[PDB]
């Protein structure tokens, strides 16, 4: 379940084999956060904290959220993230090496000191000679590479320096990446510090990106989880970075479910809530070949416009409650395969909690009087009045 | 001497690039006896939209250029990175190749001649053939499903009437990627096309008014009607309405090989064809 608002712990009071995350860090350690034993009983005592690493993001992932525009800046981004497993980080200096000892300091800036030898440690780094490290450097690391990428030049006796014109053609990069690593509300979302393990062989993006997605959908078949329903929470994020997030995670689904394939995977039921503000080419994988790999959806949404037409006509059943606007009605019309233009009509004025359904399951179109739910969401009125007197 | 190429725009060995350019230009140096892989477009696009003169009598990579021709090489590097894209498309290279310039058109003719069948005189192995396709993402579809029919067509028109074998061709899914010159002549070269598919409003109305026969089943959508109502000839609206509520297995069929409208109850097939995809209770159910 995907929760935005987070309403949905205290619908599954009383069901074995649930889990309940929320996204963010803790206020403070000392806050109570225990686990649960296997066959017990869900009670509203219990809950998880997680943020989301930097690196699960990958080389193409993290080429969107940057967003090279204009002059030598794709190149420079390119020739920074093919380097990261020979950078180091000790104190506060970032630094090269090579295989007898020597080292050499890195600048943000355009410091002129000991700028004679650097084509060459350049070139030797772009031809993989230099040695190479076992730790994931931090995120704000990719500023001061792309800046010596960018501020190299020739100089006229026979050596090295940093030019000033080299500079102006990458400047706006460098000037969102360092706004975006010093912003309150993305990185309590976002692990920017590294710190972890990265292994040798040339294939240390797929295991970042696979044990997040291990994580967040659950393992193959085969293994053994841990929980049957999982409700992450998401009431910490800001409206500006959700897309650009969620986005991310559900694109990173779909290509361990291709390398997964039809032999090991195990059906799933996904939930997604107020799908209009996310699921806006390479962005529609899961939609499309979601039942080749045993993954279905359900959408909902109040603004069924703002979604496209390629996506609400993949559906074989459809629920509809009250919807007023003509720019919605004209969608449902135009999108929909099953039905009759005689049952439209009663959907401008249906009662609260009156729905009309008809699809595949339904031999012929019903309007149905929904039950309610006991115990039913943590959803409620914020009241004024009360502490007003 | 050689002469290295680069795909950014660093600075070595940039004073002597026209000179080498224009010879090339002109045909004037030697040739190789392999294929390059695809990936060697995206340096020769930008060095051949970085060449600048420089002021003291040499050559220059401006940044300037640059800009111009970045969202190119910026499509050509994308695509051979995807996995799913270099997994249909063998991009690596190392073939062989020969002089006078008939390398495009040899690999050409031998994939159209193993998806398509040879021609007229020559023993041929199969008789039906079957590409299964499911393995190919619904992004791609359009791309290279709309090209192999149309290199297909290329060689048909050079090839002649004389010389081809009559065949029948069935697609389905058409809406995906049909959406004009093949169906125009396909009647000389013995060209039968049967398409199959479910949003006939999706398509080039050339294509459906250039039939001859028409089955349909139930249709329930306005738009979808009005599409056969156009492909047909007037004189017929009594017929039109039974579609709205046709059930399970029957059709309406009208054309040339039918006297009048007729409405048929269809056979089953025996044995037919992949029953379904998975089913949710059966994996849940297996404690």
Same mark, same amino acid.
């Given at each position: ?137 931090? @995120? ?76 967040? @959908? ?143 399951? @339904? ?27 | ?5 680069? #795909?950014?725009?660093? #600075? ?86 020969? #002089? ?123 738009? #979808? ?63």
């Amino acid at each position: 379940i995907f929760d935005i608002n987070g309403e949905y712990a205290q619908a599954f009071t009383g069901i074995p084999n649930v889990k309940h995350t929320i996204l963010g860090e803790s206020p403070n350690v000392d806050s109570l956060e225990k686990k649960q034993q296997k066959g017990e009983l869900y009670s509203e005592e219990y809950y998880c904290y997680k943020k989301i690493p930097y690196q699960a993001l990958g080389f193409a992932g993290l080429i969107k959220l940057l967003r090279p525009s204009d002059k030598t800046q794709l190149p420079a981004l390119r020739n920074a993230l093919s380097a990261i497993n020979r950078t180091h980080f000790k104190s506060r200096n970032i630094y090269l090496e090579k295989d007898d000892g020597e080292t050499f300091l890195l600048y943000d800036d355009c410091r002129d000191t000991n700028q004679s030898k650097l084509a060459e440690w350049l070139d030797l780094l772009r031809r993989r000679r230099l040695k190479r490290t076992n730790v994931w450097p931090p @995120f704000k690391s990719l500023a001061t590479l792309v800046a010596e990428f960018g501020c190299v030049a020739a100089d006229r006796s026979n050596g090295s320096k940093r030019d000033a014109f080299g500079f102006s053609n990458v400047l706006p990069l460098v000037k969102i990446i360092q706004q975006l690593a010093e912003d309150i509300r993305f990185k309590s979302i976002v692990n920017l510090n590294g710190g972890g393990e990265l292994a040798d062989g040339g294939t240390h993006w797929d295991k970042a990106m696979s044990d997040e997605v291990d994580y967040f @959908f659950g393992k193959e078949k085969g293994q053994e989880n841990d929980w049957n329903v999982h409700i992450v929470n998401m009431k910490n994020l800001a409206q500006d970075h959700a897309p650009m997030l969620l986005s991310a995670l559900l694109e990173m689904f779909a290509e361990i479910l291709f390398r997964r394939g039809q032999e090991r995977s195990y059906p799933t039921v996904l939930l997604l809530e107020e799908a209009h503000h996310y699921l806006r080419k390479a962005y529609e994988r899961l939609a499309k070949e979601g039942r080749k790999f045993k993954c279905s959806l359900i959408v909902s949404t109040q603004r069924p416009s703002e979604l496209s037409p390629t996506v609400l006509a993949m559906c074989s059943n459809w629920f509809s409650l009250r919807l007023t606007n003509e720019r919605d009605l004209q969608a449902l019309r135009y999108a929909m395969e099953s039905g009759n233009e005689q049952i439209l009509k009663q959907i401008s004025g249906l009662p609260r909690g009156d729905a009309v359904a008809f699809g595949s399951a @339904f031999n012929l179109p019903v309007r149905i009087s929904i039950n309610q739910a006991r115990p039913g969401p943590k959803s409620s009125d914020a009241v004024f009045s009360e502490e007003w007197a | 001497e050689t002469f290295l190429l680069y #795909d950014d725009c660093r #600075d070595t060995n940039q004073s002597k690039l026209a000179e080498w350019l224009d010879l090339l230009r002109r045909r004037r140096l030697k040739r190789t006896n392999v294929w390059p892989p695809f990936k060697s477009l995206a340096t020769l696009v930008a060095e051949f939209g970085c060449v600048a003169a420089d002021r003291s009598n040499g050559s220059k990579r401006d940044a300037f250029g640059f800009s111009n021709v970045l969202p190119l090489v910026k499509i050509i590097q994308q695509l051979a990175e995807d996995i799913r894209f270099k997994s249909i498309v063998n991009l690596n290279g190392g073939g062989e190749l020969a #002089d006078g310039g008939t390398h495009w058109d040899k690999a050409m003719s031998d994939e159209v001649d193993y998806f398509f069948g040879k021609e007229k005189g020559q023993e041929n192995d199969w008789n039906v053939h079957i590409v299964n396709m499911k393995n190919l993402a619904q992004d791609h579809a359009p791309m290279l499903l709309s090209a192999l029919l149309e290199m297909f067509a290329e060689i048909l028109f050079r090839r002649g009437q004389e010389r081809s074998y009559p065949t029948v061709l069935l697609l389905e899914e058409a809406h995906h990627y049909l959406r004009e010159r093949l169906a125009k002549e396909g009647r000389k070269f013995k060209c039968s096309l049967i398409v199959s598919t479910q949003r006939p409003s999706e398509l080039s109305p050339t294509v459906l008014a250039m039939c001859s026969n028409w089955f349909s089943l139930r249709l329930t959508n306005e738009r #979808d009607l009005q599409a056969l109502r156009y492909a047909m000839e007037s004189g017929n609206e009594q017929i039109l309405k039974q579609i709205s509520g046709l059930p399970r297995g029957d059709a309406v069929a009208f054309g040339s090989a039918f006297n009048l409208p007729v409405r048929i109850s269809i056979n089953q097939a025996r044995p037919g064809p992949k029953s379904s995809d998975a089913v949710f209770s059966e994996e849940w159910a297996n404690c």
